[PDB]
């Protein structure tokens, strides 16, 4: 029902946030890849690139708009792989919603990226 | 054996002329070997592709791959995600399913597979199509009849297929067609070994009979093999992914006429050194 709840909200991302704050389970069935864990660590990559501290997921399965079958606000994820911090891997869709990729080094701000 | 991505039907069993028996195997269960947070289908397709790595697959620069039965009740395409991981970058991956799902493929075709039309030929066909099944075990039609025609009309010479079968979900013409390949086998993935599921894999398509296979017999042969050779579940192969992606072979693609396809060309097709098809623009239908 989380997919519907967000699908039929004026602001799906806000709707997802509210859903979580009220004790809803994160969206499941994000597709975890099997990988080496010796990758570049970058946020969004052509192939799994999880480093030792990440998991690699199929991109579309981690996209709220893909999963809800609704219009995108722009897809940066579909057909690609998203690296997600193991500690956040329970909620890959939320992670990609709440976070932003650094446009210089290509890592997640507040996570993999270290810059000024 | 436990280290292998799975087990291929040994030649000894392919040679038999068995009668059709019931299979002593339960397709289901909680699976003790699937690593945590990993889907059965990611594990299963991973092992399938690990197996395909050991074969002389043709790998053109502009590879074309079509994936049938890509969707699931979950609404996502785990198998497609693995294919997309396995194949060379910017390989055309098209997938299809009867019901809607989200995909990491370039195109997703929704609808019965019988509605899927294309002018272009493919280098690799993967099918995971399945209908959950009457007191007899006969060749099943449905998607299998489409598949056989698809293979015959749209698989490039040199191309390869992997088609999911089980005890009850199998087709006699598909088995027959396996003998139009340079090599074939029935492959059981180690993570799902206690199920009657296998992938019929044809390697390097020749467009003509190499062997005379009787479908009904070969399926009995398959069952006999499964009944008398239990396989211990295993996910050993999953713990080293370092060599996973398919090798960039740069396999030549040539458009040849039937009269140009001579013994030395067949020999090239048999060895996985040639693909024969046009290089036109790829258009796929509803
Ligand atoms: N006639 C048909 N045409 C197209 N798809 C079919 C047909 N019959 C069964 N299927 C599909 O076969 C699929 C079987 C699934 N178990 C495949 C799982 C999927 N390969 C995965 O990676 O998880 C279902 O999604 C069905 O919709
Ligand atoms: Cl959130
Ligand atoms: Cl491998
Ligand atoms: Cl036979
Ligand atoms: Cl060559
Ligand atoms: Cl073409
Ligand atoms: Mg050979
Ligand atoms: Na017969
Ligand atoms: Zn998306
Ligand atoms: Zn940065």
Short mmCIF file of C-alpha atoms and ligand atoms in Angstrom, two decimals:
data_model
loop_
_atom_site.label_atom_id
_atom_site.label_comp_id
_atom_site.label_asym_id
_atom_site.label_seq_id
_atom_site.Cartn_x
_atom_site.Cartn_y
_atom_site.Cartn_z
CA UNK A 1 0.00 0.00 0.00
CA UNK A 2 3.02 2.29 0.45
CA UNK A 3 3.38 2.40 -3.35
CA UNK A 4 -0.24 3.53 -3.77
CA UNK A 5 -0.02 5.94 -0.84
CA UNK A 6 2.92 7.69 -2.54
CA UNK A 7 1.56 7.27 -6.11
CA UNK A 8 -1.56 9.23 -5.13
CA UNK A 9 0.17 12.05 -3.29
CA UNK A 10 0.82 15.49 -4.76
CA UNK A 11 4.36 15.16 -3.39
CA UNK A 12 5.32 11.43 -3.49
CA UNK A 13 8.70 11.96 -1.82
CA UNK A 14 7.11 13.87 1.06
CA UNK A 15 4.43 11.19 1.20
CA UNK A 16 7.14 8.53 1.59
CA UNK A 17 8.85 10.55 4.30
CA UNK A 18 5.52 10.88 6.20
CA UNK A 19 4.85 7.21 5.74
CA UNK A 20 8.14 6.36 7.46
CA UNK A 21 7.75 8.90 10.29
CA UNK A 22 4.47 7.19 11.21
CA UNK A 23 6.06 3.73 11.49
CA UNK A 24 5.60 2.29 7.99
CA UNK A 25 8.02 -0.34 6.69
CA UNK A 26 10.47 0.88 4.02
CA UNK A 27 9.79 -0.25 0.43
CA UNK A 28 11.03 -3.79 -0.03
CA UNK A 29 12.31 -5.86 -2.97
CA UNK A 30 15.03 -3.46 -3.97
CA UNK A 31 17.36 -5.71 -5.96
CA UNK A 32 20.64 -6.36 -4.18
CA UNK A 33 23.36 -7.51 -6.54
CA UNK A 34 26.08 -10.03 -5.77
CA UNK A 35 29.39 -8.22 -6.13
CA UNK A 36 33.11 -8.09 -5.14
CA UNK A 37 32.87 -5.09 -2.81
CA UNK A 38 36.08 -3.77 -4.40
CA UNK A 39 34.47 -1.06 -6.55
CA UNK A 40 35.01 2.67 -6.99
CA UNK A 41 32.35 3.51 -4.39
CA UNK A 42 30.56 5.97 -6.66
CA UNK A 43 26.84 6.65 -6.17
CA UNK A 44 25.47 5.71 -9.56
CA UNK A 45 27.45 3.49 -11.88
CA UNK A 46 27.19 1.46 -15.05
CA UNK A 47 27.92 -1.77 -13.08
CA UNK A 48 27.99 -2.76 -9.41
CA UNK A 49 30.66 -0.66 -7.70
CA UNK A 50 29.92 -1.13 -4.02
CA UNK A 51 33.06 -0.66 -1.90
CA UNK A 52 33.61 -2.52 1.41
CA UNK A 53 31.05 -0.26 3.12
CA UNK A 54 28.27 -0.41 0.56
CA UNK A 55 25.72 -2.58 -1.21
CA UNK A 56 24.91 -2.50 -4.92
CA UNK A 57 21.27 -2.43 -6.05
CA UNK A 58 19.56 -2.47 -9.44
CA UNK A 59 18.74 1.16 -10.00
CA UNK A 60 15.09 1.00 -11.04
CA UNK A 61 14.13 -1.06 -7.99
CA UNK A 62 15.46 1.77 -5.85
CA UNK A 63 13.53 4.52 -7.59
CA UNK A 64 10.25 5.71 -5.99
CA UNK A 65 8.93 6.99 -9.30
CA UNK A 66 9.79 3.76 -11.11
CA UNK A 67 8.36 1.64 -8.30
CA UNK A 68 5.17 3.76 -8.08
CA UNK A 69 4.85 3.86 -11.89
CA UNK A 70 4.47 7.65 -11.87
CA UNK A 71 6.14 10.59 -13.62
CA UNK A 72 9.69 11.50 -12.61
CA UNK A 73 10.38 15.08 -11.44
CA UNK A 74 13.45 15.43 -13.77
CA UNK A 75 15.63 8.77 -14.59
CA UNK A 76 19.09 8.76 -13.07
CA UNK A 77 18.80 5.25 -11.60
CA UNK A 78 17.01 3.00 -14.11
CA UNK A 79 19.41 0.83 -16.11
CA UNK A 80 22.21 1.59 -13.66
CA UNK A 81 23.36 0.48 -10.24
CA UNK A 82 23.14 2.46 -7.06
CA UNK A 83 25.59 2.07 -4.23
CA UNK A 84 24.05 2.38 -0.79
CA UNK A 85 25.79 2.50 2.64
CA UNK A 86 25.28 -0.88 4.31
CA UNK A 87 23.86 0.86 7.42
CA UNK A 88 21.18 2.46 5.16
CA UNK A 89 20.54 -0.62 2.98
CA UNK A 90 17.27 -1.47 4.76
CA UNK A 91 15.78 1.51 2.87
CA UNK A 92 17.51 2.07 -0.51
CA UNK A 93 14.53 4.02 -1.92
CA UNK A 94 14.51 6.41 1.05
CA UNK A 95 18.26 6.84 0.83
CA UNK A 96 18.16 7.93 -2.83
CA UNK A 97 15.23 10.24 -2.01
CA UNK A 98 16.91 11.97 0.97
CA UNK A 99 20.40 12.18 -0.57
CA UNK A 100 22.35 13.95 -3.28
CA UNK A 101 25.34 12.98 -5.44
CA UNK A 102 28.42 15.24 -5.49
CA UNK A 103 28.92 16.53 -9.03
CA UNK A 104 32.75 16.58 -8.72
CA UNK A 105 33.76 13.18 -7.22
CA UNK A 106 30.44 11.34 -7.86
CA UNK A 107 29.82 10.08 -4.33
CA UNK A 108 27.04 10.55 -1.79
CA UNK A 109 27.27 13.81 0.21
CA UNK A 110 27.64 13.10 3.93
CA UNK A 111 28.70 9.53 3.16
CA UNK A 112 31.36 8.54 0.61
CA UNK A 113 32.33 12.08 -0.42
CA UNK A 114 35.15 13.94 1.34
CA UNK A 115 35.64 17.50 0.00
CA UNK A 116 35.45 21.25 0.78
CA UNK B 1 30.84 -30.02 -7.56
CA UNK B 2 29.70 -27.83 -4.65
CA UNK B 3 32.00 -25.07 -6.04
CA UNK B 4 30.39 -25.12 -9.50
CA UNK B 5 27.62 -22.63 -10.33
CA UNK B 6 25.53 -25.78 -10.81
CA UNK B 7 25.32 -29.14 -12.52
CA UNK B 8 24.87 -29.93 -16.24
CA UNK B 9 23.07 -33.08 -17.41
CA UNK B 10 25.86 -35.57 -18.14
CA UNK B 11 26.10 -37.04 -21.64
CA UNK B 12 25.46 -40.54 -20.24
CA UNK B 13 21.93 -39.47 -19.33
CA UNK B 14 21.28 -37.66 -22.63
CA UNK B 15 22.01 -40.91 -24.46
CA UNK B 16 19.32 -43.00 -22.68
CA UNK B 17 15.86 -43.93 -23.95
CA UNK B 18 13.98 -43.67 -20.66
CA UNK B 19 10.26 -43.91 -20.13
CA UNK B 20 8.59 -40.90 -18.53
CA UNK B 21 8.33 -41.23 -14.72
CA UNK B 22 7.14 -38.83 -12.02
CA UNK B 23 9.84 -36.59 -10.52
CA UNK B 24 10.64 -37.21 -6.84
CA UNK B 25 11.35 -33.53 -6.24
CA UNK B 26 9.64 -30.63 -4.47
CA UNK B 27 10.06 -27.26 -6.36
CA UNK B 28 9.62 -25.23 -3.14
CA UNK B 29 11.00 -24.64 0.38
CA UNK B 30 12.75 -21.97 2.44
CA UNK B 31 16.19 -21.92 0.84
CA UNK B 32 19.05 -22.53 3.22
CA UNK B 33 21.82 -21.39 0.80
CA UNK B 34 20.63 -17.95 -0.41
CA UNK B 35 22.84 -15.28 1.22
CA UNK B 36 21.14 -12.61 3.34
CA UNK B 37 19.17 -9.91 1.56
CA UNK B 38 19.70 -11.70 -1.74
CA UNK B 39 16.76 -12.83 -3.87
CA UNK B 40 16.60 -16.43 -5.10
CA UNK B 41 16.46 -15.07 -8.66
CA UNK B 42 19.53 -12.90 -8.35
CA UNK B 43 21.37 -15.99 -7.02
CA UNK B 44 19.87 -18.22 -9.69
CA UNK B 45 20.62 -15.95 -12.68
CA UNK B 46 24.07 -15.22 -11.25
CA UNK B 47 24.84 -18.97 -11.33
CA UNK B 48 23.29 -19.26 -14.83
CA UNK B 49 25.58 -16.55 -16.13
CA UNK B 50 28.54 -18.09 -14.28
CA UNK B 51 27.72 -21.28 -16.21
CA UNK B 52 27.34 -19.43 -19.49
CA UNK B 53 30.88 -18.00 -18.84
CA UNK B 54 32.31 -21.53 -19.34
CA UNK B 55 30.76 -21.88 -22.80
CA UNK B 56 31.86 -20.62 -26.23
CA UNK B 57 29.23 -17.86 -26.35
CA UNK B 58 29.51 -15.41 -29.24
CA UNK B 59 29.89 -11.84 -27.99
CA UNK B 60 29.56 -9.24 -30.79
CA UNK B 61 30.57 -5.60 -30.24
CA UNK B 62 26.92 -4.63 -30.42
CA UNK B 63 25.31 -7.54 -28.67
CA UNK B 64 21.52 -8.02 -28.76
CA UNK B 65 19.83 -9.84 -25.85
CA UNK B 66 16.14 -10.47 -25.34
CA UNK B 67 14.79 -11.67 -21.97
CA UNK B 68 11.41 -13.39 -21.68
CA UNK B 69 9.58 -13.83 -18.37
CA UNK B 70 11.56 -10.98 -16.80
CA UNK B 71 8.91 -9.68 -14.43
CA UNK B 72 7.73 -11.11 -11.12
CA UNK B 73 4.98 -10.77 -8.48
CA UNK B 74 7.37 -8.44 -6.61
CA UNK B 75 7.13 -5.92 -9.50
CA UNK B 76 10.88 -5.87 -10.22
CA UNK B 77 13.25 -7.67 -12.59
CA UNK B 78 16.00 -9.38 -10.59
CA UNK B 79 17.09 -11.57 -13.53
CA UNK B 80 17.30 -8.58 -15.79
CA UNK B 81 19.39 -6.81 -13.16
CA UNK B 82 21.85 -9.72 -13.27
CA UNK B 83 21.84 -9.89 -17.07
CA UNK B 84 22.47 -6.15 -17.20
CA UNK B 85 25.38 -6.71 -14.74
CA UNK B 86 26.78 -9.66 -16.68
CA UNK B 87 26.64 -8.38 -20.26
CA UNK B 88 29.01 -5.87 -21.92
CA UNK B 89 28.16 -2.16 -21.41
CA UNK B 90 25.73 -0.82 -24.03
CA UNK B 91 24.61 -4.30 -25.01
CA UNK B 92 21.00 -4.02 -26.07
CA UNK B 93 18.92 -5.75 -23.37
CA UNK B 94 15.20 -6.06 -24.06
CA UNK B 95 12.92 -7.77 -21.59
CA UNK B 96 9.35 -8.87 -21.54
CA UNK B 97 6.58 -10.18 -19.29
CA UNK B 98 2.82 -10.72 -19.28
CA UNK B 99 2.37 -8.30 -16.33
CA UNK B 100 3.89 -4.88 -15.64
CA UNK B 101 7.17 -4.58 -13.71
CA UNK B 102 10.12 -2.19 -13.34
CA UNK B 103 13.29 -3.06 -15.23
CA UNK B 104 16.94 -2.14 -15.76
CA UNK B 105 16.64 -3.19 -19.41
CA UNK B 106 16.81 -0.73 -22.32
CA UNK B 107 13.22 -1.69 -23.35
CA UNK B 108 10.44 -3.47 -21.46
CA UNK B 109 7.65 -5.13 -23.44
CA UNK B 110 4.44 -5.77 -21.53
CA UNK B 111 1.86 -8.29 -22.74
CA UNK B 112 1.69 -11.96 -23.66
CA UNK B 113 4.94 -12.91 -25.38
CA UNK B 114 2.89 -13.93 -28.48
CA UNK B 115 2.33 -10.16 -29.02
CA UNK B 116 6.11 -9.57 -29.16
CA UNK B 117 7.17 -8.91 -32.77
CA UNK B 118 10.59 -7.87 -34.13
CA UNK B 119 12.33 -7.85 -37.56
CA UNK B 120 15.80 -8.12 -36.00
CA UNK B 121 17.68 -11.20 -34.93
CA UNK B 122 19.22 -11.76 -31.50
CA UNK B 123 22.52 -13.07 -30.18
CA UNK B 124 21.09 -14.48 -26.95
CA UNK B 125 17.61 -15.46 -25.78
CA UNK B 126 16.92 -15.98 -22.09
CA UNK B 127 13.58 -17.25 -20.95
CA UNK B 128 12.27 -17.68 -17.44
CA UNK B 129 8.63 -17.98 -18.49
CA UNK B 130 6.50 -20.16 -16.26
CA UNK B 131 2.84 -20.97 -15.67
CA UNK B 132 1.95 -22.83 -12.40
CA UNK B 133 0.52 -25.99 -14.19
CA UNK B 134 -4.83 -33.01 -14.95
CA UNK B 135 -3.07 -36.38 -14.40
CA UNK B 136 -0.72 -36.68 -17.40
CA UNK B 137 2.59 -34.99 -18.29
CA UNK B 138 2.46 -33.89 -21.94
CA UNK B 139 4.49 -31.40 -23.94
CA UNK B 140 3.18 -28.01 -22.92
CA UNK B 141 2.28 -25.42 -25.54
CA UNK B 142 1.64 -21.77 -24.56
CA UNK B 143 4.78 -19.63 -24.63
CA UNK B 144 6.86 -22.62 -25.68
CA UNK B 145 5.28 -22.64 -29.16
CA UNK B 146 6.05 -18.95 -29.57
CA UNK B 147 9.58 -19.48 -28.23
CA UNK B 148 10.35 -22.27 -30.71
CA UNK B 149 9.22 -20.07 -33.58
CA UNK B 150 11.10 -17.13 -32.16
CA UNK B 151 14.30 -19.10 -31.94
CA UNK B 152 13.83 -20.46 -35.48
CA UNK B 153 13.04 -17.10 -37.01
CA UNK B 154 14.88 -14.54 -34.88
CA UNK B 155 18.00 -16.21 -33.40
CA UNK B 156 21.19 -15.37 -35.30
CA UNK B 157 23.30 -18.27 -36.46
CA UNK B 158 25.93 -18.58 -33.77
CA UNK B 159 23.52 -17.30 -31.11
CA UNK B 160 22.58 -19.03 -27.87
CA UNK B 161 19.56 -19.61 -25.65
CA UNK B 162 18.73 -20.50 -22.06
CA UNK B 163 15.15 -21.60 -21.48
CA UNK B 164 13.64 -22.48 -18.15
CA UNK B 165 11.90 -25.84 -17.84
CA UNK B 166 10.66 -27.94 -14.94
CA UNK B 167 9.14 -31.40 -14.60
CA UNK B 168 5.73 -30.17 -15.83
CA UNK B 169 6.75 -27.01 -17.72
CA UNK B 170 8.60 -28.31 -20.78
CA UNK B 171 8.06 -28.68 -24.51
CA UNK B 172 8.92 -31.43 -26.95
CA UNK B 173 9.77 -29.18 -29.89
CA UNK B 174 12.14 -27.12 -27.71
CA UNK B 175 14.06 -30.29 -26.89
CA UNK B 176 14.14 -31.21 -30.58
CA UNK B 177 15.43 -27.75 -31.40
CA UNK B 178 18.32 -28.21 -28.95
CA UNK B 179 19.82 -30.54 -31.58
CA UNK B 180 20.10 -27.58 -33.99
CA UNK B 181 22.86 -26.18 -31.78
CA UNK B 182 26.56 -26.92 -31.77
CA UNK B 183 26.08 -28.10 -28.17
CA UNK B 184 23.25 -28.23 -25.64
CA UNK B 185 22.58 -29.25 -22.04
CA UNK B 186 20.07 -29.09 -19.23
CA UNK B 187 21.61 -27.00 -16.48
CA UNK B 188 20.57 -27.06 -12.82
CA UNK B 189 21.75 -24.11 -10.74
CA UNK B 190 23.29 -25.10 -7.40
CA UNK B 191 21.20 -22.64 -5.35
CA UNK B 192 17.95 -24.21 -6.59
CA UNK B 193 19.13 -27.81 -6.97
CA UNK B 194 16.35 -29.50 -5.06
CA UNK B 195 13.79 -28.19 -7.53
CA UNK B 196 13.06 -29.95 -10.87
CA UNK B 197 13.83 -26.66 -12.63
CA UNK B 198 16.60 -26.61 -15.24
CA UNK B 199 17.71 -24.30 -18.02
CA UNK B 200 17.85 -25.81 -21.46
CA UNK B 201 20.92 -24.22 -22.91
CA UNK B 202 21.69 -24.34 -26.62
CA UNK B 203 25.16 -23.03 -27.45
CA UNK B 204 25.99 -21.65 -30.93
CA UNK B 205 22.90 -21.96 -33.12
CA UNK B 206 23.32 -23.71 -36.50
CA UNK B 207 19.84 -23.32 -38.04
CA UNK B 208 19.75 -27.01 -38.91
CA UNK B 209 19.71 -30.44 -37.24
CA UNK B 210 23.02 -31.68 -35.86
CA UNK B 211 21.33 -34.52 -33.88
CA UNK B 212 17.88 -36.04 -34.02
CA UNK B 213 16.38 -35.39 -30.62
CA UNK B 214 13.06 -36.80 -29.57
CA UNK B 215 11.50 -34.32 -27.14
CA UNK B 216 9.42 -36.71 -25.10
CA UNK B 217 12.33 -39.13 -24.67
CA UNK B 218 14.84 -36.44 -23.75
CA UNK B 219 12.54 -35.06 -21.08
CA UNK B 220 12.14 -38.57 -19.60
CA UNK B 221 15.89 -38.71 -19.73
CA UNK B 222 16.01 -35.40 -17.90
CA UNK B 223 13.64 -36.64 -15.16
CA UNK B 224 15.58 -39.89 -14.79
CA UNK B 225 18.79 -37.96 -14.23
CA UNK B 226 17.12 -35.75 -11.58
CA UNK B 227 15.46 -38.69 -9.78
CA UNK B 228 18.63 -40.76 -9.47
CA UNK B 229 21.09 -37.91 -8.86
CA UNK B 230 20.18 -35.74 -5.89
CA UNK B 231 22.15 -32.46 -5.79
CA UNK B 232 23.07 -30.81 -2.50
CA UNK B 233 22.04 -27.13 -2.46
CA UNK B 234 25.04 -24.80 -2.77
CA UNK B 235 25.94 -21.14 -3.08
CA UNK B 236 29.72 -21.52 -2.97
CA UNK B 237 30.10 -19.89 -6.44
CA UNK B 238 28.36 -16.73 -5.24
CA UNK B 239 31.26 -15.76 -2.93
CA UNK B 240 33.69 -14.92 -5.68
CA UNK B 241 32.26 -12.49 -8.21
CA UNK B 242 35.64 -11.20 -9.46
CA UNK B 243 35.48 -12.77 -12.91
CA UNK B 244 31.72 -12.40 -13.42
CA UNK B 245 31.08 -10.23 -16.47
CA UNK B 246 30.94 -11.90 -19.85
CA UNK B 247 34.23 -11.71 -21.84
CA UNK B 248 34.47 -9.09 -24.58
CA UNK B 249 35.11 -11.43 -27.47
CA UNK B 250 34.51 -8.96 -30.32
CA UNK B 251 32.83 -11.74 -32.27
CA UNK B 252 32.52 -10.88 -35.93
CA UNK B 253 29.02 -10.24 -37.21
CA UNK B 254 28.39 -10.91 -40.92
CA UNK B 255 25.29 -10.95 -43.05
CA UNK B 256 25.69 -14.05 -45.22
CA UNK B 257 23.43 -15.75 -47.76
CA UNK B 258 22.64 -19.49 -47.37
CA UNK B 259 24.93 -20.34 -50.31
CA UNK B 260 27.88 -18.57 -48.66
CA UNK B 261 27.41 -20.66 -45.50
CA UNK B 262 29.88 -23.44 -46.20
CA UNK B 263 31.75 -26.01 -44.09
CA UNK B 264 34.40 -23.60 -42.86
CA UNK B 265 31.68 -21.08 -41.85
CA UNK B 266 29.68 -23.78 -39.98
CA UNK B 267 32.92 -24.64 -38.28
CA UNK B 268 33.29 -21.01 -37.23
CA UNK B 269 29.69 -20.95 -35.94
CA UNK B 270 30.26 -24.20 -33.99
CA UNK B 271 33.26 -22.70 -32.21
CA UNK B 272 31.52 -19.47 -31.25
CA UNK B 273 33.58 -17.34 -33.61
CA UNK B 274 30.84 -15.95 -35.82
CA UNK B 275 27.39 -14.43 -35.64
CA UNK B 276 25.28 -14.27 -38.81
CA UNK B 277 22.62 -11.57 -39.05
CA UNK B 278 21.99 -8.06 -40.36
CA UNK B 279 23.20 -4.99 -38.42
CA UNK B 280 19.99 -2.94 -39.03
CA UNK B 281 18.20 -0.65 -36.53
CA UNK B 282 16.40 -2.60 -33.79
CA UNK B 283 12.63 -2.12 -33.46
CA UNK B 284 10.48 -4.25 -31.08
CA UNK B 285 6.63 -4.43 -30.84
CA UNK B 286 3.88 -4.57 -28.15
N1 LIG C 1 2.62 -16.53 -21.91
C1 LIG C 1 3.44 -15.69 -21.23
N2 LIG C 1 3.91 -14.57 -21.82
C2 LIG C 1 4.73 -13.74 -21.13
N3 LIG C 1 5.10 -14.00 -19.86
C3 LIG C 1 4.65 -15.11 -19.23
C4 LIG C 1 3.81 -15.98 -19.91
N4 LIG C 1 3.52 -16.98 -19.07
C5 LIG C 1 4.17 -16.74 -17.90
N5 LIG C 1 4.86 -15.60 -18.01
C6 LIG C 1 5.70 -14.95 -16.96
O1 LIG C 1 6.76 -15.76 -16.45
C7 LIG C 1 7.18 -15.16 -15.22
C8 LIG C 1 7.79 -16.20 -14.29
C9 LIG C 1 8.55 -15.56 -13.13
N6 LIG C 1 8.77 -16.55 -12.09
C10 LIG C 1 9.89 -15.02 -13.63
C11 LIG C 1 10.75 -14.41 -12.53
C12 LIG C 1 11.80 -13.44 -13.09
N7 LIG C 1 12.61 -14.10 -14.16
C13 LIG C 1 12.74 -12.96 -12.02
O2 LIG C 1 13.88 -12.59 -12.32
O3 LIG C 1 12.43 -12.90 -10.84
C14 LIG C 1 5.94 -14.47 -14.65
O4 LIG C 1 6.26 -13.10 -14.43
C15 LIG C 1 4.89 -14.59 -15.72
O5 LIG C 1 4.19 -13.36 -15.92
CL1 LIG C 2 12.44 10.06 3.79
CL1 LIG C 3 32.47 -16.77 -13.50
CL1 LIG C 4 15.87 -38.23 -27.97
CL1 LIG C 5 37.87 -14.52 -35.33
CL1 LIG C 6 18.85 -6.50 -37.89
MG1 LIG C 7 32.65 -26.15 -29.25
NA1 LIG C 8 8.77 -41.11 -30.00
ZN1 LIG C 9 13.06 5.99 -11.98
ZN1 LIG C 10 32.40 15.29 -3.54
#
